[PDB]
Amino acid sequence: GSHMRGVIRKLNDDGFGVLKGILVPFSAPGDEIIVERVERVKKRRVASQWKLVRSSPLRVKCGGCTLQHLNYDYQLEFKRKKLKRILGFEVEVVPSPKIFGHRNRIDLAITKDGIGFREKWWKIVDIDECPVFGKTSREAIERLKEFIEEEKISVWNIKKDEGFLRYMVLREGKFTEEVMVNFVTKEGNLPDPTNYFDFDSIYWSVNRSKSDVSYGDIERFWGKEFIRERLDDVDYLIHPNSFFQTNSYQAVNLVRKVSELVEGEKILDMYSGVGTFGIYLAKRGFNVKGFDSNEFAIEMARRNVEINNVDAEFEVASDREVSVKGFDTVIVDPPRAGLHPRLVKRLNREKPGVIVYVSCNPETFARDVKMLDYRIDEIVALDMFPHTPHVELVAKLV
Ligand SMILES: Nc1ncnc2c1ncn2[C@@H]1O[C@H](CSCC[C@H](N)C(=O)O)[C@@H](O)[C@H]1O
Known part of the structure; x- marks a missing residue:
């Protein structure tokens, strides 16, 4: 009973609450909780299911x-x-x-059950917008669903690790209002994305590696080769394969x-x-x-x-x-x-x-x-x- 119940007093360095030794993700100091099941992870016990009994006053997806x-x-x-x-x-x-x-860059996994981010490596959280990136992501994601449906694009089946289209990576200059979309795929052919998006640059990247990476080799681009971000008086060219x-x-x-x-x-x-x-x-x-x-x-x-x-x-x-x-x-x-x-x-x-x-x-x-x-x-x-x-x-x- 009570070993699986208590108030969270601290978060560890990775931001997980600790309840009498149990790691409890997405908890807050002052939460009162009951741990319904734990797993072993890296030899620490992690709550996989828990119920929030009393809300922390420190409480208020990506x-x-x-x-x-x-x-x-x-x-x-x-x-x-x-x-x-x-x-x-x-x-x-x-x-x-x-x-x-x-946030001026996001990677959205594009998968058989939804566009979004991983939860659970198999399991996608489907989203209509990414608030940390902001409102450009809503427009990008609805245009992307039209593109995939009208063109019948093969999307990532993550259980089997198959499928052509794997990520839409969106980048935007906050101070320039320029927007870049990059499609990361496997080998194969991407239909012309031109008339589906209204952004400054559209990239197609092919990831020929066996890794799950949200970049690949530049296969082609439409519109601008680069967009720009501006920090005070300084402009920086943004490209899918460089860090900013x-x-x-x-x-x-x-x-x-x-x-x-x-x-x-x-x-x-x-x-x-x-x-x-x-x-x-x-x-x-x-x-x-x-x-x-x-x-x-x-x-x-x-x-x-x-x-x-x-x-x-x-x-x-x-x-x-x-x-x-x-x-x-x-x-x-x-x-x-x-x-x-x-x-x-x-x-x-x-x-x-x-x-x-x-x-x-x-x-x-x-x-x-x-x-x-x-x-x-x-x-x-x-x-x-x-x-x-x-x-x-x-x-x-x-
Ligand atoms: N052994 C090594 N020698 C020199 N550079 C290295 C290195 N290993 C990694 N790097 C580089 O180290 C950098 C760390 S990130 C640096 C960020 C940069 N100041 C910026 O404003 O964007 C990366 O660009 C990476 O390419």
């Missing part, structure tokens, strides 16, 4: 949005506290300017903030991607060199340099090998793995006077600052990811 039943102020509190446990000290979480309509900061309104704060934290004239944009921070800084007359191991990112960074009339130099390079000799500030914005030991080595050997570390993984961040011959001087967290447990750190190291 894929990954495991905090969405929580009011937004409490999401920010959970983040402050998560960051304070982890980093051992206190850090402001800047709220996202918009918490609906903020997913919350355009917090990305504004993110670029503003990095440019406040840097020192000198010589900036290394390390792990630059498409040049978000290097190029915003080149436009405010800094002197910029960036490096990224991804070749296509670098190509996009160079196309972005061209459209922004700045002079910033981007090259392909690995962090096992990039040199940091000669700079006033190094910006690092590493992948999940964190800083390569060799680059920390070379940074401690050359010690540039400021490193600005941008991270979405506060624990790898702290692992790396303790490996660095450097002190956290300033740190601010930005709520780049409303409704999920993730947060983004910007720290000035010295």
Whole structure:
């Protein structure tokens, strides 16, 4: 009886409530609940069925949005506290300017039983609109159902992993009102999508790999080759296969903030991607060199340099090998793995006077600052990811 009943007192780091040891997703501190069945997962007990007996006062759909039943102020509190446990000290979480309509890219699985996101890998949640992306998704999804029905398009059967059409990935410039649709399919032939959509760019991508990925090789496009997003005075070309900061309104704060934290004239944009921070800084007359191991990112960074009339130099390079000799500030914005030991080595050997570390993984961040011959001087967290447990750190190291 009572071992399966109680009030939730805390959420763990992934945002799941904990009831007397049981993990209970989509619960809130102050909820009073009864766990009707548990499973074993990664050797922890997870409630698979539970009943809400009394609502938490912290209570108020998207894929990954495991905090969405929580009011937004409490999401920010959970983040402050998560960051304070982890980093051992206190850090402001800047709220996202918009918490609906903020997201500039979504992947919708297109499946035999519905268009939407995965629940349950087999089971699709069918949606008519994605509020984190916003109202463009309603129009895209109704146009997509007409396209599939009139053209009799083969859609993904996820039990059997078969079918031609697998994702519609929607991208939009929040500050430009340009919209891009990308159809991700298997091998085969996509009918002309032209007269079914009214967007700036339509892409067809073929994923020839065996992975379940919401991108593939560009097979063809109609309309614009690129759309644009604009962060203050800076334009960035958006393409289906390059990464861009997913919350355009917090990305504004993110670029503003990095440019406040840097020192000198010589900036290394390390792990630059498409040049978000290097190029915003080149436009405010800094002197910029960036490096990224991804070749296509670098190509996009160079196309972005061209459209922004700045002079910033981007090259392909690995962090096992990039040199940091000669700079006033190094910006690092590493992948999940964190800083390569060799680059920390070379940074401690050359010690540039400021490193600005941008991270979405506060624990790898702290692992790396303790490996660095450097002190956290300033740190601010930005709520780049409303409704999920993730947060983004910007720290000035010295
Ligand atoms: N060993 C390595 N060396 C250099 N770059 C790497 C790397 N492993 C991954 N990367 C790159 O690290 C970057 C981390 S994301 C960087 C985001 C970028 N500042 C932006 O504004 O969009 C990615 O672009 C990825 O291509």
